[PDB]
Design an enzyme around this catalytic site. Structure first.
Site, PDB file in Angstrom:
ATOM      1  CG  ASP A  89      -1.586   1.305   1.516  1.00  0.00           C
ATOM      2  OD1 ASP A  89      -1.592   2.174   0.622  1.00  0.00           O
ATOM      3  OD2 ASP A  89      -2.162   1.470   2.613  1.00  0.00           O
ATOM      4  CE  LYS A 115      -1.477   7.285  -3.888  1.00  0.00           C
ATOM      5  NZ  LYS A 115      -1.987   6.255  -2.936  1.00  0.00           N
ATOM      6  CD  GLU A 132      -4.913   4.009  -2.910  1.00  0.00           C
ATOM      7  OE1 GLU A 132      -5.768   4.797  -2.458  1.00  0.00           O
ATOM      8  OE2 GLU A 132      -3.766   4.381  -3.244  1.00  0.00           O
ATOM      9  CG  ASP A 184      -9.017   5.031   1.936  1.00  0.00           C
ATOM     10  OD1 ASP A 184      -8.400   5.485   2.922  1.00  0.00           O
ATOM     11  OD2 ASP A 184      -8.496   4.263   1.096  1.00  0.00           O
TER      12      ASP A 184
HETATM   13 CA    CA Z   1      -4.013   4.943   3.624  1.00  0.00          CA
END
Ligand code: CA
Ligand code: ADP
Ligand code: CL
Length: 380
Positions: free
Chosen positions: A8, A69, A173, A197
């Site tokens: 992840d 990212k 994800e 999330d």
């Molecule tokens: Ca996370």
């Protein structure tokens, strides 16, 4: 025979797991943490990754990189890049229309592509896995947001390769999260799954439709600039005023001070997730003046009330785009380190017909967990 890993590669934290003998193992880093900061720091003698990098940020801000990212797979001219650049302490330069992070390293000027910084975080996660298994790891599955485009996915894959990994697959994800809770194994009809999330810098809501083992992204919504760091900052602004009221001094101008406070507030916040109060103790915060204070959970909740409540809007928007009533969601999945906030959990619970929440998997380990499973499946 060697096992493959699931990584992840988060916006602010990364996590690695491996499926072994029927179960998933989330691997602890050298400091005993199951999550590692997606940070890379450069000094006059070394390159730091993870905890060590984030720990010396206050004393080396211009050369401690994070948020790679946000740049990965994008163009220098992309409005997102130009906007984000204004909030980072490190330099971002143009290179043939591609952004590069420029820092001072071992006595000189060096520039790195986003996927290079990200490959460094991946190497760290790879070595953590390797020390655990006892052998070299060469295969991996890496997650990315469901909204990532072909370009962003390609750069991320390139990162894995640069880190010496064969990327079996780049997966979403929220998909990884669904897999963690085993929603990919029922084969009986179709069901609606909503993924809430909330991490340290981003908030993602995904509505998936799993029809007999098949995943389908129904809708996605959220805020790429809303996350736990914003809650830390509400605490920061809070204490700045308190320090300003008790010692008559505005510390908002001393960078190192603001940073040390933000770090203290972050830890205080976490404590407020299990206890109704938390203490903040910083030595020589400003001009040798110490800063020991306290704060209640409720006060914290009040300070972030608007932020917490704003998380329901992307939720309702996703329900609309997916043409579903909140009652039509069969599975409510909360993942991300920030969903540990009691308040955030209650707002979601009340919203969703006061239903019970699923507390079977760790929220900040969920994405890596699903990634590990899929990696094992792909490995036979
Ligand atoms: Ca996370
Ligand atoms: N117990 C906790 N209580 C409140 N917030 C937490 C807790 N644990 C972690 N967090 C927050 O979750 C965020 C990290 O989320 P995570 O999903 O692991 O990473 P990422 O930002 O890379 O998605 C941080 O803002 C962190 O402070
Ligand atoms: Cl480590």
């Amino acid at each position: 025979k060697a096992a493959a890993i699931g990584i992840d590669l988060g916006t602010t934290y990364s996590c690695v797991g491996v499926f072994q003998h029927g179960k998933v193992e989330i691997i602890a880093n050298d400091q005993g943490n199951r999550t590692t900061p997606s940070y890379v720091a450069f000094t006059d003698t070394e390159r730091l990754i993870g905890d060590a990098a984030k720990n010396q940020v206050a004393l080396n801000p211009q050369n401690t990189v994070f948020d790679a990212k946000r740049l990965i797979g994008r163009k220098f001219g992309d409005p997102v890049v130009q906007s984000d650049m204004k909030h980072w302490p490190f330099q971002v330069i143009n290179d043939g229309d591609k952004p590069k992070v420029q820092v001072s390293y071992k006595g000189e000027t060096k520039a790195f592509y986003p996927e290079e910084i990200s490959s460094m975080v991946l190497t760290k996660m790879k070595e953590i896995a390797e020390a655990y298994l006892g052998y070299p790891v060469t295969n991996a599955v890496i997650t990315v947001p469901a909204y990532f485009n072909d370009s962003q996915r390609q750069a991320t894959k390139d990162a894995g390769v640069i880190a010496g990994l064969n990327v079996l697959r780049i997966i979403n994800e929220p998909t990884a999260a669904a897999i963690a809770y085993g929603l990919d194994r029922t084969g009986k009809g179709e069901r609606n799954v909503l993924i809430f999330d909330l991490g340290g810098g981003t908030f993602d809501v995904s509505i998936l439709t799993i029809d007999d083992g098949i995943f389908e992204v129904k809708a996605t919504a959220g805020d790429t600039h809303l996350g736990g760091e914003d809650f830390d900052n509400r605490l920061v602004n809070h204490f700045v005023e308190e320090f300003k009221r008790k010692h008559k001094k505005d510390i908002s101008q001393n960078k190192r001070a603001v940073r040390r406070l933000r770090t203290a507030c972050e830890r205080a916040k976490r404590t407020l997730s299990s206890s109704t109060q938390a203490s903040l103790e910083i030595d020589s915060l400003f001009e040798g003046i110490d800063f020991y204070t306290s704060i209640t959970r409720a006060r914290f909740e009040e300070l972030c009330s608007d932020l917490f409540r704003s998380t329901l809007e992307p939720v309702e928007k996703a329900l609309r785009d997916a043409k579903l009533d909140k009652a039509q969601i069969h599975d409510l999945v909360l993942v991300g380190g920030s969903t540990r906030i009691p308040k955030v959990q209650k707002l979601l619970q009340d919203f969703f017909n006061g239903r019970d929440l699923n507390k079977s998997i760790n929220p900040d380990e969920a994405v890596a967990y699903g990634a590990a499973v899929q990696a094992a499946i792909l490995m036979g």
